[PDB]
């Protein structure tokens, strides 16, 4: 019968791919040490103090 030539419309209606929330970066002890360059072997030595006995 009748034939009509029409576009293919593309819409965005707010359907996104579902992704998780990020919570772990804030709960972890971050950057107590920074001077990793300027230390040999890219390693900072952390000193644990001494405990003795009587």
């Amino acid at each position: 019968a009748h034939i009509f030539v029409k576009p293919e419309l593309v819409a965005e209606i707010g359907v996104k791919q579902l992704q998780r929330e990020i919570v772990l970066p804030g709960l972890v002890w971050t950057n107590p040490l920074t001077d990793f360059g300027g230390s040999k072997n890219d390693t900072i030595t952390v000193r644990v103090p001494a405990i003795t006995t009587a």
């Binding site: 072997n41 890219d42 390693t43």
Partner: protein
Amino acid sequence: GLISDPVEVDPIQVGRDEAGWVQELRDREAWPKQEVPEQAKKPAKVGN
């Protein structure tokens, strides 16, 4: 060598691996759970 040559081994990386303080971890997706790696249980050094 030459600038066009492939990147050679960094002495800093060699020393870093020799010190053995780079954290190794259990494979999260492995089943059954893997045994703890050797470095993950190495004692603190007596000095430095």
